[PDB]
Coordinates of C-alpha atoms and ligand atoms in Angstrom, one line a residue:
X5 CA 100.0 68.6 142.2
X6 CA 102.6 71.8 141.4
X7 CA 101.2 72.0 137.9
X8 CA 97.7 72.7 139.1
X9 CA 95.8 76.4 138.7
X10 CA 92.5 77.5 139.4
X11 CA 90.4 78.9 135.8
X12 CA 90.5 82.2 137.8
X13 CA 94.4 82.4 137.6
X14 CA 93.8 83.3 134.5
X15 CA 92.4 86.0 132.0
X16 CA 91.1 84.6 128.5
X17 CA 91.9 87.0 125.4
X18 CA 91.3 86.2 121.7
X19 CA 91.9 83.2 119.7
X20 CA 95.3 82.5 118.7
X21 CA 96.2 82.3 114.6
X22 CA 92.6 82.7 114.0
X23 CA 92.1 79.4 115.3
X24 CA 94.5 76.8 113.4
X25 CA 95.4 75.4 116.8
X26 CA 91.6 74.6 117.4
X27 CA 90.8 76.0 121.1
X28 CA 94.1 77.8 121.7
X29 CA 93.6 81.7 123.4
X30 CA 96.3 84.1 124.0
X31 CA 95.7 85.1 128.1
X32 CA 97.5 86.6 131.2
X33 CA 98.5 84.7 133.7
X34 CA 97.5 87.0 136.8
X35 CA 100.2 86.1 139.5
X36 CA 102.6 87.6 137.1
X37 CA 100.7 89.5 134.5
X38 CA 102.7 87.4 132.2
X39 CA 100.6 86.6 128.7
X40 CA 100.8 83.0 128.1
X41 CA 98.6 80.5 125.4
X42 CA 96.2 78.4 126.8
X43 CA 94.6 75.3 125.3
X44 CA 90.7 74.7 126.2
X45 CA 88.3 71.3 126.4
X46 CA 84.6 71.8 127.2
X50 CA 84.7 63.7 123.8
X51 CA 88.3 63.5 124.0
X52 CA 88.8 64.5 128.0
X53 CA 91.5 61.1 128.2
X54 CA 93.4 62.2 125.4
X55 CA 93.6 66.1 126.9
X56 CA 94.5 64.9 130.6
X57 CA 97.3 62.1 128.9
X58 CA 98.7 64.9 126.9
X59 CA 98.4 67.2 130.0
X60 CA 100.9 64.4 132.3
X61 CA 103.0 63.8 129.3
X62 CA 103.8 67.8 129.3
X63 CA 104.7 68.2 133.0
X64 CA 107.9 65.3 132.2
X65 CA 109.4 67.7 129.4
X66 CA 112.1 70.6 129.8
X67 CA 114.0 71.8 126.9
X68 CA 115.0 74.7 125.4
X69 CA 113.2 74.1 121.7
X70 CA 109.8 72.6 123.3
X71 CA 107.4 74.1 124.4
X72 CA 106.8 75.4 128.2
X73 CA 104.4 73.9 130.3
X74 CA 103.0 76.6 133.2
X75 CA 100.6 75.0 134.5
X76 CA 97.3 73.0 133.8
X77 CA 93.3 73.2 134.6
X78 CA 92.4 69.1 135.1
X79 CA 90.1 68.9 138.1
X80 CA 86.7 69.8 136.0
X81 CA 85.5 71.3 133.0
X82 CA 86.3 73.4 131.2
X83 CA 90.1 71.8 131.2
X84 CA 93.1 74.1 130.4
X85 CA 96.7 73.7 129.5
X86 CA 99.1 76.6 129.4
X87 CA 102.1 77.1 128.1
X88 CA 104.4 80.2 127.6
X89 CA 103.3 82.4 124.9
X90 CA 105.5 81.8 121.2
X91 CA 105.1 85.6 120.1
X92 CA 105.5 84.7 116.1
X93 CA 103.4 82.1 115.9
X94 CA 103.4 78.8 113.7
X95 CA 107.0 78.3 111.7
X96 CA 105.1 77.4 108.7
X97 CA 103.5 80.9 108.1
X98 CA 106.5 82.2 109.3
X99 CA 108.5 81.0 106.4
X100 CA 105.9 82.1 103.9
X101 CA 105.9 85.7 105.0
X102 CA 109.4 86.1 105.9
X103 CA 111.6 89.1 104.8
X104 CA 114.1 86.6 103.4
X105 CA 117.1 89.5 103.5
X106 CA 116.5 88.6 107.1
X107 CA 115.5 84.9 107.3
X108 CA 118.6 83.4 105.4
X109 CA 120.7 80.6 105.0
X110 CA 122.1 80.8 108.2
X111 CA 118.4 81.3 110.0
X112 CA 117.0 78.3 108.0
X113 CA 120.1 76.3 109.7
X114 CA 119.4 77.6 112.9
X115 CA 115.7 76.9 112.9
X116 CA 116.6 73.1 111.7
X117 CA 119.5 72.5 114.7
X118 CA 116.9 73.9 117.5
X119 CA 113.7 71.4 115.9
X120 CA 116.8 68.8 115.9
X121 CA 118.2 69.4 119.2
X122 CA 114.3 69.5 120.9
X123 CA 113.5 65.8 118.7
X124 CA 117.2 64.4 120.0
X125 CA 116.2 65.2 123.6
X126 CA 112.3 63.5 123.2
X127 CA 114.6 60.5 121.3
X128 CA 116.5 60.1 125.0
X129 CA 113.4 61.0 126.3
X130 CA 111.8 57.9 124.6
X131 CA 109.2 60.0 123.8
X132 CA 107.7 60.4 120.2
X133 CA 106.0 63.2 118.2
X134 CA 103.0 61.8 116.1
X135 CA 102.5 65.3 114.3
X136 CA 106.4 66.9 113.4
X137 CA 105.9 69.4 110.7
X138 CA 106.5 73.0 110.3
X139 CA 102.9 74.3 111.5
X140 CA 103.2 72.4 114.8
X141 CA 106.5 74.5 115.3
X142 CA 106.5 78.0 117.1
X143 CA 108.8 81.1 116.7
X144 CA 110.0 83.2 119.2
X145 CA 112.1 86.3 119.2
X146 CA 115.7 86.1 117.3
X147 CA 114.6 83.4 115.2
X148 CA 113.9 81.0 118.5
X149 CA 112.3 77.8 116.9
X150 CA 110.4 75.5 119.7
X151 CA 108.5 72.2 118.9
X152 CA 104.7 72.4 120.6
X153 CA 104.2 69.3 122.4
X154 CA 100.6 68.5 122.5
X155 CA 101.1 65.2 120.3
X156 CA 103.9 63.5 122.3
X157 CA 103.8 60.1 123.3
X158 CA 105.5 57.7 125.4
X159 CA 107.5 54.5 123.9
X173 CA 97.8 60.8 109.8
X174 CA 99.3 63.6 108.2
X175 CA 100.1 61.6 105.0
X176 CA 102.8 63.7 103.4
X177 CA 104.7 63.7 106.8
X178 CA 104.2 60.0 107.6
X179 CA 106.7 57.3 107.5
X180 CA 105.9 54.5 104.8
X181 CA 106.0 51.5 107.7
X182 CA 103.7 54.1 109.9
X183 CA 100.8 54.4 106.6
X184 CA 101.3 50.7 106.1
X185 CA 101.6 49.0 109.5
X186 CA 99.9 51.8 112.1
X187 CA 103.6 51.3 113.5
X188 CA 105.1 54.7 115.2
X189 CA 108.3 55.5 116.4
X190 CA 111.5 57.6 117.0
X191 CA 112.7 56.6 113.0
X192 CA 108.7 57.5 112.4
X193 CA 109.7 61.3 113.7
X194 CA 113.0 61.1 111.8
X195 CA 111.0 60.8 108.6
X196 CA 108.8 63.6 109.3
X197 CA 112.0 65.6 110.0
X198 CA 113.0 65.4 106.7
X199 CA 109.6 66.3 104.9
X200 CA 109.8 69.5 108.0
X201 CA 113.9 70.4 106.4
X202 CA 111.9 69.9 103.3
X203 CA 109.3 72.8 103.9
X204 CA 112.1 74.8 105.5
X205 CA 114.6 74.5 102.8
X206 CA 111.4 76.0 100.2
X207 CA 110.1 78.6 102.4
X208 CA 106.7 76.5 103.3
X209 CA 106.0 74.9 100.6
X210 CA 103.5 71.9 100.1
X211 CA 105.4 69.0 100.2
X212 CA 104.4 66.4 97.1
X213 CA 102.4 68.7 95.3
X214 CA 99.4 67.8 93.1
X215 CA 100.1 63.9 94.2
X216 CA 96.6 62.3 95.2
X217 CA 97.2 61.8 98.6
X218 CA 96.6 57.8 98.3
X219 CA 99.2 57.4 95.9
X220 CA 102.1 58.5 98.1
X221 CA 103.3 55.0 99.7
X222 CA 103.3 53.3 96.2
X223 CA 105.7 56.4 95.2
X224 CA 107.8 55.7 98.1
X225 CA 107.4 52.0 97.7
X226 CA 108.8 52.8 94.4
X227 CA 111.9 54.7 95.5
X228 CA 110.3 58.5 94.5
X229 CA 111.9 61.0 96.3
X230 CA 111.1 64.8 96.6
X231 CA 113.9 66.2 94.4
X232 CA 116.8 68.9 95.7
X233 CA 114.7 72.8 96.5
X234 CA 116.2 75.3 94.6
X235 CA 119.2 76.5 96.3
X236 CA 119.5 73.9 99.1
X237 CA 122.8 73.3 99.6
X238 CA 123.8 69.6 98.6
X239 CA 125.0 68.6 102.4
X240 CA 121.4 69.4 103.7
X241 CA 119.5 67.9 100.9
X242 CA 121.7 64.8 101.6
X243 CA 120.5 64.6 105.0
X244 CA 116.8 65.0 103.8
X245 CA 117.5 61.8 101.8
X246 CA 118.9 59.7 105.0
X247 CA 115.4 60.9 107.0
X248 CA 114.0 59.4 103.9
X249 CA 115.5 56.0 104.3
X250 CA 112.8 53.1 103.5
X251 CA 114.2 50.8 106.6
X252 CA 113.6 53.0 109.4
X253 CA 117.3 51.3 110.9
X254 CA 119.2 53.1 107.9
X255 CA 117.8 56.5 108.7
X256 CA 120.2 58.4 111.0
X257 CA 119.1 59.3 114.8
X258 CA 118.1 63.1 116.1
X259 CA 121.8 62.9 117.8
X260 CA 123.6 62.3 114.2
X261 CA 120.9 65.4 112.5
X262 CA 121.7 67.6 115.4
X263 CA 125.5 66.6 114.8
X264 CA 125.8 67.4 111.1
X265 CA 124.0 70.4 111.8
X266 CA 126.8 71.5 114.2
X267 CA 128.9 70.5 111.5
X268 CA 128.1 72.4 108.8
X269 CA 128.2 75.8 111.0
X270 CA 131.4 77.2 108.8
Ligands
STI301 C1 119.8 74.5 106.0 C2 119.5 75.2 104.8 C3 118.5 74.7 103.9 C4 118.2 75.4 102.8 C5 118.8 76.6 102.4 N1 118.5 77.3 101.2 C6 118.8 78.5 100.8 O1 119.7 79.2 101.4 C7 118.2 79.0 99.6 C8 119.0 79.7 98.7 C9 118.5 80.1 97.5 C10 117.1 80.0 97.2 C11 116.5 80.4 95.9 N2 116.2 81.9 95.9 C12 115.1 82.2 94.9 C13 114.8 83.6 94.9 N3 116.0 84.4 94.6 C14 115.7 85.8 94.6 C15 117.1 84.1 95.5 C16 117.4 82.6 95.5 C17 116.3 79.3 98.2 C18 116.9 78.9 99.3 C19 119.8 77.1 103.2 C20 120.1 76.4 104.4 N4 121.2 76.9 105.3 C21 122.4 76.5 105.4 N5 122.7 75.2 104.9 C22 124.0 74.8 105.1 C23 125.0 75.6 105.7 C24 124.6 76.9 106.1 C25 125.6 77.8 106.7 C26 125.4 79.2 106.7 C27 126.3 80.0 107.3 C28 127.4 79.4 108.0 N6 127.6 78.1 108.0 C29 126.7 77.3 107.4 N7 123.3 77.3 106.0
1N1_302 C1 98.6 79.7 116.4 C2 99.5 80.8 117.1 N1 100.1 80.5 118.2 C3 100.9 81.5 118.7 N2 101.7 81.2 119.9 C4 101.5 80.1 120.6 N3 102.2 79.9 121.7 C5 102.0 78.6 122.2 C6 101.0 77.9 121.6 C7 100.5 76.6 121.9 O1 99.8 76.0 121.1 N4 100.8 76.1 123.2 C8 100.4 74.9 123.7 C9 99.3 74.9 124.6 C10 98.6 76.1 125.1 C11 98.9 73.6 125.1 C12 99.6 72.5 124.7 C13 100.6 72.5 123.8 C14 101.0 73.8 123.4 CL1 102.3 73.9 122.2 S1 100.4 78.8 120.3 C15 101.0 82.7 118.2 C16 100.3 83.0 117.0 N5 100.2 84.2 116.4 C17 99.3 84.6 115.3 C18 100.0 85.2 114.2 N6 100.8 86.4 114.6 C19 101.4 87.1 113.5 C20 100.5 87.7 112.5 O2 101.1 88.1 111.3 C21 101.7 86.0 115.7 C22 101.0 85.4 116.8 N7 99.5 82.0 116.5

């Protein structure tokens, strides 16, 4: 296996975002005294390894980079290249907002589009697409981490036919795409906010929509509301969002 490291490869530093990724460490990879993020497992060893395989099959710009992987025994690694920035979420709250604009906010929602358009081709799936589980990088780089992918809940990000049914897919992601242009279009807000969290399907059901953000421009909030489609066949694919996104580059 290419993918595969020896532990002593690498050097373990401190916990990365103070430990909102669970077991996720900053460390140096010593062949090249590069610092990369590694994810730890000393319970849920299948899940880790599946996750692990999934990871090795993925190469785009706006996910995540596999280096390589500890899997032989424990404790079991995965690491990646190092996001510098950390989660797009906090990002967004803490932003200079002189600097991260209207044109950075349409940036950041082409590359998360571009990254969920290649997993659609991919027929892969994310079970988790929101604005924490996206890293920045340098020059307002936007990549979607990729331990939740899956081959083919968060409530507030979930898909009504994925609360009511357990059913996921690609439409499933598209739904959480638009609560994710949701959190980016407010600078990280909550989404839904004071809504008892077992009220939100009979909202939906009910045709409740979160309304227009403050200065979102009507084209993108549009958009939002064809993510929020209640037949997941009406809502547009990754390829379309990545398209309009293009598109609205003036
Ligand atoms: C994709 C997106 C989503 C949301 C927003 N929202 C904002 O841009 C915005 C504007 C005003 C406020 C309110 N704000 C409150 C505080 N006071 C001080 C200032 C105003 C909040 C967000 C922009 C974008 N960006 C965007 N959208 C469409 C087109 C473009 C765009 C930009 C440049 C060139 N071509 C296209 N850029
Ligand atoms: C939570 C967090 N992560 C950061 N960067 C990461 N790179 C990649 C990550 C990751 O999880 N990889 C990964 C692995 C390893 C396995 C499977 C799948 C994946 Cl995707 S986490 C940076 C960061 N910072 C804290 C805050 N600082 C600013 C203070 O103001 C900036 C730095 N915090």
């Amino acid at each position: 296996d290419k993918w595969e490291m020896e532990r002593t490869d690498i050097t373990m530093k401190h916990k990365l975002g103070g430990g909102q990724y669970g077991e996720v460490y900053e460390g140096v990879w010593k062949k090249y005294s590069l610092t990369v993020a590694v994810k730890t497992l000393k319970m849920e060893v299948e899940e880790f390894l599946k996750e692990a395989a999934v990871m090795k099959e993925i190469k785009h710009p706006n996910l995540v980079q596999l280096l390589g992987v500890c899997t032989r025994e424990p404790p079991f690694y995965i690491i990646t290249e190092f996001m510098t920035y950390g989660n797009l979420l906090d990002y967004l709250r803490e932003c200079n907002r002189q600097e991260v604009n209207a044109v950075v906010l349409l940036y950041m929602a082409t590359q998360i589009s571009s990254a969920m358009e290649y997993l659609e081709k991919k027929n892969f799936i994310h079970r988790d697409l929101a604005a924490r589980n996206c890293l920045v990088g340098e020059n307002h780089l936007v990549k979607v981490a990729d331990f939740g992918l899956s081959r083919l809940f968060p409530i507030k990000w979930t898909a009504p036919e994925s609360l009511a049914y357990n059913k996921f897919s690609i439409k499933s992601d598209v739904w959480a795409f638009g609560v994710l242009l949701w959190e980016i279009a407010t600078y990280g807000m909550s989404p839904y906010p004071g809504i008892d969290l077992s009220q939100v399907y009979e909202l939906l059901e009910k045709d409740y929509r979160m309304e227009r953000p403050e200065g979102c421009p009507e084209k993108v909030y549009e958009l939002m509301r064809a993510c929020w489609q209640w037949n997941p066949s009406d809502r547009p694919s990754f390829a379309e969002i990545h398209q309009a996104f293009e598109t609205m580059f003036q």
